[PDB]
Design an enzyme around this catalytic site. Structure first.
Site, mmCIF file in Angstrom:
data_model
loop_
_atom_site.group_PDB
_atom_site.id
_atom_site.type_symbol
_atom_site.label_atom_id
_atom_site.label_comp_id
_atom_site.label_asym_id
_atom_site.label_seq_id
_atom_site.Cartn_x
_atom_site.Cartn_y
_atom_site.Cartn_z
ATOM 1 N N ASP A 40 -6.292 7.688 -1.194
ATOM 2 C CA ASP A 40 -6.889 7.875 0.100
ATOM 3 C C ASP A 40 -5.884 8.060 1.234
ATOM 4 O O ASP A 40 -4.727 7.618 1.139
ATOM 5 C CB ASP A 40 -7.917 6.812 0.459
ATOM 6 C CG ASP A 40 -9.165 6.879 -0.403
ATOM 7 O OD1 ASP A 40 -9.479 7.973 -0.922
ATOM 8 O OD2 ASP A 40 -9.846 5.817 -0.548
ATOM 9 N N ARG A 41 -6.351 8.776 2.271
ATOM 10 C CA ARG A 41 -5.657 9.067 3.546
ATOM 11 C C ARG A 41 -4.486 10.028 3.456
ATOM 12 O O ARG A 41 -4.437 10.976 4.230
ATOM 13 C CB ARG A 41 -5.212 7.801 4.293
ATOM 14 C CG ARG A 41 -6.380 6.877 4.654
ATOM 15 C CD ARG A 41 -5.993 5.822 5.670
ATOM 16 N NE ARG A 41 -7.093 4.929 5.928
ATOM 17 C CZ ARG A 41 -7.370 3.827 5.225
ATOM 18 N NH1 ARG A 41 -6.616 3.433 4.224
ATOM 19 N NH2 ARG A 41 -8.404 3.097 5.560
ATOM 20 N N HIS B 260 -4.506 -7.786 -3.394
ATOM 21 C CA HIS B 260 -4.435 -6.769 -2.360
ATOM 22 C C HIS B 260 -4.829 -7.363 -1.019
ATOM 23 O O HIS B 260 -4.097 -7.243 -0.026
ATOM 24 C CB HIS B 260 -5.356 -5.595 -2.692
ATOM 25 C CG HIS B 260 -5.365 -4.547 -1.647
ATOM 26 N ND1 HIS B 260 -4.298 -3.704 -1.447
ATOM 27 C CD2 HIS B 260 -6.284 -4.223 -0.706
ATOM 28 C CE1 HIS B 260 -4.564 -2.880 -0.450
ATOM 29 N NE2 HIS B 260 -5.770 -3.163 0.014
ATOM 30 N N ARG C 270 -13.757 -5.567 9.893
ATOM 31 C CA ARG C 270 -14.060 -4.465 8.974
ATOM 32 C C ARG C 270 -15.540 -4.343 8.608
ATOM 33 O O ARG C 270 -15.991 -3.329 8.101
ATOM 34 C CB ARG C 270 -13.262 -4.617 7.654
ATOM 35 C CG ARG C 270 -11.716 -4.616 7.802
ATOM 36 C CD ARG C 270 -11.127 -5.044 6.472
ATOM 37 N NE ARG C 270 -9.700 -5.302 6.486
ATOM 38 C CZ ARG C 270 -8.765 -4.376 6.295
ATOM 39 N NH1 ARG C 270 -9.107 -3.091 6.182
ATOM 40 N NH2 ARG C 270 -7.498 -4.737 6.260
ATOM 41 N N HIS D 273 -1.169 4.659 -0.264
ATOM 42 C CA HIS D 273 -2.121 5.625 0.319
ATOM 43 C C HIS D 273 -1.681 7.099 0.229
ATOM 44 O O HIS D 273 -1.581 7.776 1.243
ATOM 45 C CB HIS D 273 -2.454 5.285 1.786
ATOM 46 C CG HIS D 273 -3.422 4.159 1.877
ATOM 47 N ND1 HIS D 273 -4.629 4.200 1.227
ATOM 48 C CD2 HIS D 273 -3.292 2.909 2.376
ATOM 49 C CE1 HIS D 273 -5.237 3.040 1.391
ATOM 50 N NE2 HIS D 273 -4.457 2.250 2.105
ATOM 51 N N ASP E 235 -4.213 0.202 -3.423
ATOM 52 C CA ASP E 235 -4.376 1.166 -2.387
ATOM 53 C C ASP E 235 -3.384 2.256 -2.579
ATOM 54 O O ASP E 235 -2.539 2.511 -1.711
ATOM 55 C CB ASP E 235 -4.353 0.542 -0.984
ATOM 56 C CG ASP E 235 -5.667 0.024 -0.580
ATOM 57 O OD1 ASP E 235 -6.539 -0.160 -1.472
ATOM 58 O OD2 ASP E 235 -5.858 -0.226 0.623
ATOM 59 N N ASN F 48 -8.872 -2.243 -2.494
ATOM 60 C CA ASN F 48 -10.229 -1.871 -2.067
ATOM 61 C C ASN F 48 -10.432 -0.362 -2.127
ATOM 62 O O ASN F 48 -11.573 0.070 -2.169
ATOM 63 C CB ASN F 48 -10.600 -2.431 -0.691
ATOM 64 C CG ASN F 48 -9.633 -2.045 0.430
ATOM 65 O OD1 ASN F 48 -8.414 -2.281 0.376
ATOM 66 N ND2 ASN F 48 -10.187 -1.454 1.481
ATOM 67 N N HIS F 49 -9.325 0.426 -2.090
ATOM 68 C CA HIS F 49 -9.427 1.886 -2.249
ATOM 69 C C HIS F 49 -9.504 2.398 -3.700
ATOM 70 O O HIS F 49 -9.863 3.566 -3.937
ATOM 71 C CB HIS F 49 -8.389 2.624 -1.426
ATOM 72 C CG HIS F 49 -8.723 2.647 0.036
ATOM 73 N ND1 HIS F 49 -9.252 3.763 0.677
ATOM 74 C CD2 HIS F 49 -8.637 1.680 0.975
ATOM 75 C CE1 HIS F 49 -9.429 3.476 1.954
ATOM 76 N NE2 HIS F 49 -9.084 2.219 2.161
ATOM 77 N N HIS G 161 -2.649 -4.681 2.336
ATOM 78 C CA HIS G 161 -3.982 -4.382 2.931
ATOM 79 C C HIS G 161 -3.963 -4.208 4.436
ATOM 80 O O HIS G 161 -4.949 -3.694 4.968
ATOM 81 C CB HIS G 161 -4.985 -5.493 2.471
ATOM 82 C CG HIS G 161 -6.443 -5.301 2.856
ATOM 83 N ND1 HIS G 161 -7.162 -4.150 2.582
ATOM 84 C CD2 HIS G 161 -7.347 -6.197 3.326
ATOM 85 C CE1 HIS G 161 -8.433 -4.333 2.936
ATOM 86 N NE2 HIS G 161 -8.569 -5.559 3.396
ATOM 87 N N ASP H 228 0.792 -1.203 0.000
ATOM 88 C CA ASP H 228 0.000 0.000 0.000
ATOM 89 C C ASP H 228 0.828 1.258 0.000
ATOM 90 O O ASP H 228 1.852 1.316 0.708
ATOM 91 C CB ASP H 228 -0.816 0.074 1.287
ATOM 92 C CG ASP H 228 -1.863 -0.999 1.399
ATOM 93 O OD1 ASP H 228 -1.584 -2.130 0.987
ATOM 94 O OD2 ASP H 228 -2.928 -0.714 1.992
#
Ligand SMILES: [Fe+3]
Ligand SMILES: [Fe+3]
Length: 287
Positions: free
Chosen positions: A84-85, A162, A210, A55, A81, A113-114, A237, A53
């Site tokens: 995001d973030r 992922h 989750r 991010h 991923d 998943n992002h 992940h 990841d």
């Protein structure tokens, strides 16, 4: 020469790099074509570097390339991923898409998943796009994300994705029949590949904290490797303190490539090198 200029500007450098809307839109349009032309289950050959990841931690991504070699000095598989973030998802995803266009046969990106519109809205990518460009550019990234491959097998022996395994995964053909473009569903095979986690304390399939997908224990991994004649599951992940972390007696590895994850953890990032005899080693990036 448009592309090399985008790359040069990306590498020039928290300091942003603001490319033009037409450039970014071209990166989505062209990479999306290449994704769709390549299979949804990639068949890759070593040697290769594999990253977890990012991010939006763009300075760490440039760090990974300093350690591993800027393309085309090394071949890459990323596990998802990208966005995001972090503070710089746009620079991160755009350099990744630039490299995929310039090196389509030696640079590979899987879906995390992002790379999903509904998750983007919540975790910052929508906002970053709206602020710096507009909502329609975000839609252009979304349509591109919907065409990413879902998994890879390196030299018939390392299965990469992922998230993890799925209880609905009986043959690799199930993955190959997944139609693109598509959004990630709330349940089922595609979901699970993007969302599942290993768990030491579970046996078989478990409820995932989750609120999406499942956990799976060591026994599930051993059975999957034996059944499909594989040596390793390589996934991402989950943040892990050392950047990588083995599970089920070295049959699964979790990779995470964003050191100091989101300001809030003190983790190293790791990158896994796989050589032509299928030996795996790790370069570590401390925070
Ligand atoms: Fe993540
Ligand atoms: Fe994830």
């Amino acid at each position: 020469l448009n592309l090399d200029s985008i790359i040069g500007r990306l590498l020039e450098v928290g300091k942003n790099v603001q490319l033009t809307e037409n450039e970014i839109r071209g990166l989505c349009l062209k990479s999306r074509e290449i994704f769709l032309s390549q299979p949804i289950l990639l068949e890759l050959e070593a040697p290769l570097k594999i990253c977890g990841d990012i991010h939006g931690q763009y300075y760490d991504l440039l760090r990974l390339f300093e350690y591993g070699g800027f393309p085309p000095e090394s071949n890459y598989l990323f596990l998802g991923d990208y966005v995001d973030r972090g503070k710089q998802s746009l620079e991160t995803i755009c350099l990744l898409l630039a490299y995929k266009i310039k090196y389509p046969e030696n640079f590979f990106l899987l879906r995390g998943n992002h790379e999903c519109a509904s998750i983007n809205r919540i975790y910052g990518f929508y906002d970053e796009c709206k602020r710096r460009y507009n909502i329609k550019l975000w839609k252009t990234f979304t349509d591109c994300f919907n065409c990413l491959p879902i998994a890879a097998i390196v030299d018939e022996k390392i299965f990469c994705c992922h998230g993890g395994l799925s209880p609905d995964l009986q043959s690799m053909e199930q993955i190959r029949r997944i139609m693109r473009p598509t959004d990630v569903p709330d349940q089922g095979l595609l979901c699970d590949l993007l969302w599942s986690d290993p768990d030491k304390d579970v046996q078989g399939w478990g409820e995932n904290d989750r609120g999406v997908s499942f956990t799976f224990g060591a026994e599930v991994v051993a059975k999957f490797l034996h059944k499909h004649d594989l040596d390793l599951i390589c996934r991402a992940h989950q943040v892990v303190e050392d950047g990588y972390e083995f599970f089920a007696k070295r049959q699964l590895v979790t990779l995470f490539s964003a050191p100091n994850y989101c300001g809030e953890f003190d983790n190293a990032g790791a990158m896994m090198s796989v050589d032509e005899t299928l030996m795996c080693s790790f370069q570590i990036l401390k925070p």
